[PDB]
RNA sequence: ACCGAUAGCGAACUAGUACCGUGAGGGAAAGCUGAAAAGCACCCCGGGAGGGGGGUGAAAAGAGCCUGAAACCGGGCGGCGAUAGGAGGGUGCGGCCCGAAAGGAAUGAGCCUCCCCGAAGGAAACCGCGGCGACGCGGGAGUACGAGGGGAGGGGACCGG
RNA sequence: CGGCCGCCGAGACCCCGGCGCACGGACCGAUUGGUCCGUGAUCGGGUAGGCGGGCGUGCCGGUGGCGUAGAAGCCGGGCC
RNA sequence: AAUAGGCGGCCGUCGAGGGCUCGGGUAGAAGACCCGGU
């Protein structure tokens, strides 16, 4: 399993997409390293213990961030929070 | 063009609010090399006048002149605490404070009433009227250990300042019983010297004669007489409106322009007047008298109390100060004095001036 | 918690990196705020900071912009300027920052990180004025 | 019978109730006094009302307190002495105590578990004003309801 | 094939009445207990008005009377609540709370595991080469993945709102 | 300033599923229509304005019914 | 002073301390503040 940090939504300057999130894994720093994680699940834990599920679908940028699509969007209190890959 | 004039009042004393405490605070201390406590405290008694041969530089030098003076009753203070200050991140921070254990009180004016013996007062009983939570089972041995710990910290060098915690003794002059607790700095450049100075007088009495010198300049700190709520005419000295004004004459006309669309804080308004913390600079200490008496020429001694007593005050019975001019505060108000912090370049000589007459006539 | 030695670091780049870390959700302590540098002309920098300190509300000084005069406060305000200060996320990110002048006793003997993207070795010529000099000109304590 | 109570869980075996209708007192001050008296024991509430009538204890104002001066002591704050409202509520409390006693409950174990004041019908009147204007001059009445319970 | 008490004549009623103007003249508002008064006997409290018991009635419908909406006011419950800024809302979800019926559901819910197909789109490890460099090109490979469309196993009460 | 490299970014463009519309076709309705298929890169914003369909209310002529085992009305919810 | 401070002392895991009430102003528009209370 891997640990990751939720950076932000997929967004333009003034537009936000609620069901796609940008996640930075701990020890990945390139597209080449990040591409190995495509197809793996991402789990977020609510304060009450509820689990929200998403899946990594694409790489983002060139610094190792990835795009995760969630069936139910993250609340937004998950920004800057920790998620579990697999 | 328009007509110019200085603004009404000063903005350097804002907010004009009631003083935080009736006991004055001292923010700055003078720099001195002599190891002595930098100031004293007393109670305002009244005003009188004298005729004296002037010794200050000026046109009227050597000529007998009229001089108003204020009498401040200064019973000896009780030195009962020592506080140490270290250097914090943003300024001085107190590191420790040690007070002396309880001792019997002998200057309390006990009186025999019908039944019961002398009350036999002790310390920590008058102090309880101010602190209300004093150490229990406090012993001389424990006090010695605390003092030794403070001294060891001084030797280690974590302490950058030391100050003396003193208490007034109004019961000596029968003014009241609740004391005023104040903190005073000690002149010098050695923390060890200041610590020894405080330690040798911990638990003792300090008199104004052992502290201040006759003829020197002082800064006087007190809380001025309260006037309640006062309008702008008296508070800021604005001009009365035209006599044909049908909405009033004792008010400001325009409280601001169209823009900015707000009332500026600089517009005079009614509010609290008096009872403000104030400091007066360069007041000469004319003389120091003992036991309510002043000696003149080694054969004449007079009572500073006027005939019939001071108005709204009793009779002076303890050591007192004669301060040239007037001082802020009301009668019986606590007054603090310190050595002058910004004296003039050409100061008067440090000695009592030649006094030819002292008024002791009825002041009521 | 990451400790950054601000000695010989460009103020703007250091502030940008630190604001980024705070937004990602880390705790940052800057330990040598007085030794950060600002490139440019000394007189121009001093005039800019003097005007910044002179900004105030006319109707009430108690509401006016309280632009800093100390070195650590200058660094803190520079970092705050690069954060979404008007949002809860920005306020929380700013609450995770501490700035000090000199090494405090609690941080002695610890690891001090540095940012190679903000070091003064990048400059062609070393024409800069330290935040300590700026604070000294402005009249701050340090 | 004519008017109902807002209390929902009334238990005749352990509780007693009383009310007063169309009282010519201030509904706002009645609300303030009822808020002060809610949750208190019956004897303590009677002593509270006696103190308020005797002017030895102010009633704080939390909702209707415009242009009201403060009072000595902690928690003040605006306060006043609604003597008329206190007297009416004291009469209602005496009635509820009598009802509880007639039921058979101990008067020394009664706690005020419900007390409320409502605006009632408005008695209309007019007062003449300048420039030939007739202007309303009305009286607002108050309904008081109280339910007390015996604690064990 | 008119209206159904702000409608219909101004007036469904002690209505051209009350009331306004010196005067010609002007001119309202206002319907409903119950099948039957059976319209609350008696007890406690209160100066009274009334309050609490107890009775009548299929039902208080209690005369301040058929139903009793909205605005407004008081109390109870759920949520927020004294360092936070936008016309009070929009998209998504999280925390707390409700959740019998009318929605799905023990003929199986959220949930967990595994297998097949798959549009537009679409990586990378590694190997070889070009470029001063950011990087790119051929293979890997149209592979992993991919909206959605199907199947099997486990568990046993939620999901929608 | 003269050039280059890689990324990010709309309801635009591409793909799957659904709705309506315009035109043509088949089949079926005792008063304007209904079901289904085919084409739409060359249909889908909209003020003034024109045109078509549909929802709701009182009463009349018919037709089929509900209701004291509870009508109308009102309050809070589920579904379409 | 949201980094919302330091120190001495008393108290809690019945109880330190305080308020109303009392006699008066070094104070006062209500609050507040200050002295005294065997």
From Swiss-Prot, chain A:
It comes from the Archaea. GO terms for cellular component: ribonucleoprotein complex; ribosome. One of its GO terms (biological process) is translation. GO terms for molecular function: structural constituent of ribosome. The keyword Ribosomal protein applies. Keywords: Ribonucleoprotein, Ribosomal protein. The keyword Cytoplasm does not apply. Pfam families: Ribosomal_L35Ae. Belongs to the eukaryotic ribosomal protein eL33 family. Part of the 50S ribosomal subunit. This is Large ribosomal subunit protein eL33.
Curated annotation (Swiss-Prot), chain B:
One of its GO terms (biological process) is translation. It comes from the Archaea. InterPro entries: L3_arc_euk, Ribosomal_L3_dom_3_arc_sf, Ribosomal_uL3, Ribosomal_uL3_arc, Ribosomal_uL3_CS, Transl_B-barrel_sf. It holds the Pfam family Ribosomal_L3. Keywords: Ribonucleoprotein, Ribosomal protein, RNA-binding, rRNA-binding. GO terms for cellular component: cytosolic large ribosomal subunit. GO terms for molecular function: rRNA binding; structural constituent of ribosome. Residues 353-364 have a biased composition (Polar residues). Residues 342-364 are annotated as: Disordered. Belongs to the universal ribosomal protein uL3 family. HAMAP family: Ribosomal_uL3_A. This is Large ribosomal subunit protein uL3. It comes from Pyrococcus furiosus (strain ATCC 43587 / DSM 3638 / JCM 8422 / Vc1). The gene is rpl3.
Swiss-Prot record, chain C:
Keywords: Ribonucleoprotein, Ribosomal protein. GO terms for cellular component: cytosolic large ribosomal subunit. Coiled coil: none annotated. InterPro entries: Ribosomal_uL13, Ribosomal_uL13_bac-type, Ribosomal_uL13_CS, Ribosomal_uL13_euk/arc, Ribosomal_uL13_sf. One of its GO terms (biological process) is translation. The keyword Iron does not apply. Part of the 50S ribosomal subunit. Belongs to the universal ribosomal protein uL13 family. This protein is one of the early assembly proteins of the 50S ribosomal subunit, although it is not seen to bind rRNA by itself. It is important during the early stages of 50S assembly. This is Large ribosomal subunit protein uL13. It comes from Pyrococcus furiosus (strain ATCC 43587 / DSM 3638 / JCM 8422 / Vc1).
From Swiss-Prot, chain D:
It comes from the Archaea. One of its GO terms (cellular component) is cytosolic large ribosomal subunit. Transmembrane segments: none annotated. The keyword RNA-binding applies. This is Large ribosomal subunit protein uL22. SUPFAM superfamilies: Ribosomal protein L22. HAMAP family: Ribosomal_uL22_A. Belongs to the universal ribosomal protein uL22 family. Keywords: Ribonucleoprotein, Ribosomal protein, RNA-binding, rRNA-binding. This protein binds specifically to 23S rRNA. It makes multiple contacts with different domains of the 23S rRNA in the assembled 50S subunit and ribosome. Pfam families: Ribosomal_L22. The keyword Ribonucleoprotein applies. Part of the 50S ribosomal subunit. CDD domains: Ribosomal_L22. One of its GO terms (molecular function) is rRNA binding. One of its GO terms (biological process) is cytoplasmic translation. InterPro entries: Ribosomal_uL22 (IPR001063), Ribosomal_uL22_CS (IPR018260), Ribosomal_uL22_euk/arc (IPR005721), Ribosomal_uL22_sf (IPR036394).
């Amino acid at each position: 399993r891997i640990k990751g940090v939720v950076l932000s939504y997929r967004r333009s300057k003034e537009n936000q997409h609620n069901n796609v999130m940008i996640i930075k894994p701990l020890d990945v720093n390139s597209r080449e390293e990040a591409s190995k994680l495509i197809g793996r699940l991402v789990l977020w834990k609510s304060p009450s213990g509820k689990i929200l599920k998403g899946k990594i679908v694409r790489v983002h940028g060139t610094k190792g961030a990835v795009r995760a699509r969630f069936e139910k969007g993250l609340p937004g209190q998950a920004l800057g929070d920790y998620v579990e890959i697999v | 063009g328009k007509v110019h004039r200085p603004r009404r009042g000063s903005l350097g004393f804002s907010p004009r609010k009631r003083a935080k405490s009736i006991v004055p605070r001292i923010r700055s201390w003078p720099k001195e090399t002599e190891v002595r406590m930098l100031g004293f405290a007393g109670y305002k008694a009244g005003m009188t006048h004298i005729l004296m041969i002037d010794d200050e530089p000026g046109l009227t030098n050597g000529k007998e002149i009229f001089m108003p003076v204020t009498i401040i009753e200064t019973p000896p203070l009780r030195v009962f605490g020592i506080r140490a200050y270290r250097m914090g991140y943003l300024g001085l921070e107190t590191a420790t404070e040690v007070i002396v254990p309880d001792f019997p009180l002998d200057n309390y004016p006990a009186k025999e009433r019908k039944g019961k013996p002398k009350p036999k007062m002790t310390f920590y009983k008058l102090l309880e009227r101010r602190i209300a939570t004093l150490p229990k089972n406090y012993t001389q041995e424990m006090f010695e250990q605390k003092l030794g710990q403070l001294e060891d910290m001084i030797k280690e060098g974590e302490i950058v300042d030391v100050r003396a915690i003193v208490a007034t003794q109004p019961w000596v002059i029968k003014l009241k019983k609740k004391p005023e607790v104040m903190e005073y700095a000690i002149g010098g450049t050695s923390v060890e010297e200041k610590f020894n100075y405080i330690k040798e007088k911990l638990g003792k009495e300090l008199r104004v004669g052992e502290v201040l010198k006759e003829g020197e300049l002082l800064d006087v700190i007190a809380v001025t007489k309260g006037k309640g709520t006062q309008g702008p005419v008296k508070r800021w000295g604005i001009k009365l409106r035209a006599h044909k004004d049908s909405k009033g004459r004792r008010k400001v006309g325009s409280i601001g322009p169209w823009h900015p669309a707000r009332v500026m804080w600089t517009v005079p308004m009614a509010g609290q007047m008096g009872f403000h913390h104030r400091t007066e600079l360069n007041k000469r200490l004319i003389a120091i008298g003992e036991n309510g008496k002043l000696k003149l020429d080694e054969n004449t001694e007079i009572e500073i109390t006027p005939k019939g007593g001071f108005p709204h005050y009793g009779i002076v019975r303890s050591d007192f100060m004669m301060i040239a001019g007037s001082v802020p505060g009301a009668i019986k108000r606590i007054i603090r004095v310190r050595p002058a912090i910004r004296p003039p370049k050409k100061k008067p000589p440090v000695q009592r001036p030649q006094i030819t007459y002292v008024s002791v006539e009825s002041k009521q | 918690m990451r400790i950054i030695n601000a000695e010989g670091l460009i103020l703007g780049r250091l502030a940008s990196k630190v604001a980024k870390m705070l937004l990602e959700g880390e705790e940052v302590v800057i330990v040598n705020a007085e030794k950060a540098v600002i490139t440019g002309n000394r007189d121009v920098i001093f005039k800019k900071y003097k005007q910044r300190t002179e900004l105030r509300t006319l109707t009430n000084p108690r509401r006016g912009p309280f632009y800093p005069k100390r070195s650590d406060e200058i660094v803190r305000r520079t970092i705050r300027g690069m954060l979404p200060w008007k949002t809860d996320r920005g306020r929380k990110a700013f609450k995770r920052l501490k700035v000090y002048v000199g090494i405090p006793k609690e941080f002695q003997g610890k690891e001090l990180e540095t940012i190679i993207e903000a070091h003064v070795s990048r400059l062609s010529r070393p024409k800069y004025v330290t935040v300590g000099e700026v604070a000294k000109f402005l009249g701050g304590k340090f | 019978k004519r008017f109902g109570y807002s209390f929902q869980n009334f238990d005749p075996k352990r509780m007693a109730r009383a009310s007063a209708r169309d009282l010519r007192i201030s509904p706002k001050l009645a609300v303030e006094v009822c808020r002060e008296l809610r949750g208190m024991m019956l004897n303590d509430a009677l002593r509270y009302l006696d103190d308020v009538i005797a002017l030895k204890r102010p009633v704080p104002l939390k909702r209707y307190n415009d242009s009201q001066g403060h009072k000595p002591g902690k928690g003040f704050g605006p306060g006043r002495y609604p003597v008329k409202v206190a007297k009416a509520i004291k009469k209602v409390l005496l009635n509820v105590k009598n009802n509880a006693v007639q039921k058979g409950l101990d008067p020394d174990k009664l706690k005020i578990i419900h007390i409320a004041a409502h605006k009632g019908p408005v008695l209309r009147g007019w007062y003449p004003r300048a420039f030939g204007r007739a202007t309303p001059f009305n009286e607002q009445t108050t309904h008081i309801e109280v339910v007390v319970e015996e604690i064990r």
